[PDB]
Design a protein around this ligand. Structure first.
Ligand code: HEM
Ligand code: HEM
Ligand code: HEM
Ligand code: HEM
Lengths: 146, 141, 141, 146
């Protein structure tokens, strides 16, 4: 993946405005609400029995924060996103069996969440710059399958 | 098959979608063509410059077909049946594109009515955009 | 949806499978569990050693469910609804897996009935299976 | 990807017995009749307006041959698969805009065509290996995308 200098700014500038804590909580919450199947990866958090229990869950909130904090390591380091995610690739790909289609569904969901929190600041250019960080990230997560 | 909740979550945000059909559905198309550049292949007869009359006029139709389907939600297949000859047979869309648009429309709504796009509603709108894709493709399968 | 040719092609090879449910059932799951390992995670209660009672017994179940959706084919959701609650709400089977089992069953039929699984037939059968995968994934959508 | 010695001697063995022409024409015959949207990349071939047409088509038949000859360039060099398909990755992605899912769809179809050819000789273990190979070709082919 090549990144433009306009792409960098669209990303760097937007990332510095994200509520990582609240942004992750919702993207993980919805991941679970829109794709209830994925909850079988998180029985460790227990109560995901209702859209609200998932929103209420401290561990789902806490996890989302951690997950999104990760995306940030990608924003930080766009040249190095392949290694940054290698130890997590290992985990998701070899220890967790997470079907890679799900890194796309998480990706998309951030976008929607990222949308929800910036509105018209999230310009189509921007969305494009990010869906593409999201896409690269989800690639790099799956790199241990190939 | 959408539940009773799905249909009210879907009718809710769509009653907020109506009145903005042209600008919304034209936004969902550009962001598509820009966040997903290969999807411009199917519009080679279009000017895909900013706010051109075709994107705006097509954007109106799409979101109008969407609200026609949102209402006749019991028989989406029956209400969008020529749209299936069109996208499946005539035009030949990788089915992966409908998911590409549905996501662009979903960002459109999150931008314009965040506090309507509630996990529960987001979840329902997606099942819908997903049953819509499926019907317009179900002229292959 | 399932066209005249679909609803007849699909009965075609399914009448050619019949006294072969248990045999074809179990072979599909084995191909699934091996061609794709992580699908075994859904069967920890299970002995997954080759041709073991529970593979053979439940393969017998799967096909009885495949063949029984092939007979009550107008209402495919109505005949396999109980296996939606199960596969979607209880077991949280990821949709990416119904695809994968589909592939496997298809490989079975093209082993024991190559002449039968013509392009045309393959294609109807894909739609049916994917009509089935879609139903058992519904306890969200 | 790391290959097994059993895996290689299963790909290798099975390859030398496939009709690269017949088995070739029929995986594209099918890619196009089970998934007819993909005909859009194949208007040059001409009449694809019926299964029969797709089957008899001189150009499709010659294409399926070349697509399968291509899988065999992988069989031969499994530790170089991505280098082999790099130039074809530029073509299918940069110049052709084929969604990488369709590479997956051709693979899944090759497997059914190969199951067809050998039957019982095409064992779960053999299928598993030939699925893996198919995955890695599709992946070296989408590499440009990433
Ligand atoms: C590309 C998107 C994703 C990113 C960037 C990401 C990143 C992360 C991070 C930072 C952790 C925390 C590591 C730890 O505390 O041990 C994690 C763990 C985990 N992830 Fe993901 N993840 C993604 C997608 C997914 C998806 C889609 C699923 C399920 C469908 C999933 C399931 C899990 C599970 C089960 C854990 C361990 C949770 C625990 O044991 O507390 N991940 N991932
Ligand atoms: C939510 C799903 C979609 C809906 C509701 C929808 C709606 C429509 C409608 C109503 C028309 C006919 C308008 C007329 O009569 O002038 C149309 C045509 C068309 N659609 Fe879609 N569409 C959808 C998805 C897609 C996708 C995913 C693509 C490809 C990326 C696509 C590409 C086209 C093209 C090229 C036309 C030609 C119409 C023209 O000449 O302006 N559509 N669509
Ligand atoms: C063609 C699609 C499928 C059909 C027709 C089907 C059919 C069935 C049926 C009829 C049952 C009830 C078994 C019983 O009463 O003992 C069942 C259970 C089950 N299925 Fe599915 N199934 C399909 C797909 C899948 C997939 C893709 C998976 C995951 C890889 C899966 C995993 C399971 C599991 C774990 C059970 C419970 C088994 C047990 O506890 O004995 N199924 N299936
Ligand atoms: C993943 C497995 C695939 C392999 C190994 C493969 C291999 C090849 C090869 C060897 C060529 C030779 C080009 C020439 O003679 O001009 C080619 C071209 C081409 N490929 Fe594929 N391909 C694959 C999948 C696909 C898929 C899934 C599609 C679309 C659905 C596709 C669309 C095309 C097109 C449109 C051409 C140029 C055809 C022409 O101009 O005659 N390919 N590919």
């Amino acid at each position: 993946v090549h990144w433009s200098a306009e792409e960098k700014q669209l990303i760097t500038g937007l990332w510095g405005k994200v509520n990582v804590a609240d942004c992750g909580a919702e993207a993980l919450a919805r991941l679970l609400i829109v794709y209830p199947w994925t909850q079988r990866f998180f029985a460790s958090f227990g109560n995901l029995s209702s859209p609200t229990a998932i929103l209420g869950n401290p561990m789902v909130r806490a996890h989302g924060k951690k997950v999104l904090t990760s995306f940030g390591d990608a924003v930080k380091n766009l040249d190095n996103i392949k290694n940054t995610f290698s130890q997590l690739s290992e985990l998701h790909c070899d220890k967790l069996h997470v079907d890679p289609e799900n890194f796309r569904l998480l990706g998309d969901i951030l976008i929607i969440v990222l949308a929800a929190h910036f509105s018209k600041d999230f310009t189509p250019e921007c969305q494009a710059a990010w869906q593409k960080l999201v896409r690269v990230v989800a690639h790099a997560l799956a790199r241990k399958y190939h | 098959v959408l539940s009773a909740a799905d249909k009210n979550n879907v009718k809710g945000i769509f009653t907020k979608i109506a009145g903005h059909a042209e600008e919304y559905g034209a936004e969902t198309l550009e962001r598509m063509f820009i966040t997903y550049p290969p999807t411009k292949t199917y519009f080679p007869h279009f000017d895909l410059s900013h706010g051109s009359a075709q994107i705006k006029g097509h954007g109106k139709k799409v979101v109008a077909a969407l609200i026609e389907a949102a209402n006749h939600i019991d028989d989406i297949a029956g209400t969008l049946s020529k749209l299936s000859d069109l996208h499946a047979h005539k035009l030949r869309v990788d089915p992966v594109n409908f998911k590409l648009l549905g996501q662009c429309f979903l960002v459109v709504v999150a931008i314009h009515h965040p506090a309507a796009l509630t996990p529960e509603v987001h979840a329902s709108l997606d099942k819908f955009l997903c049953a819509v894709g499926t019907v317009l493709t179900a002229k292959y399968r």
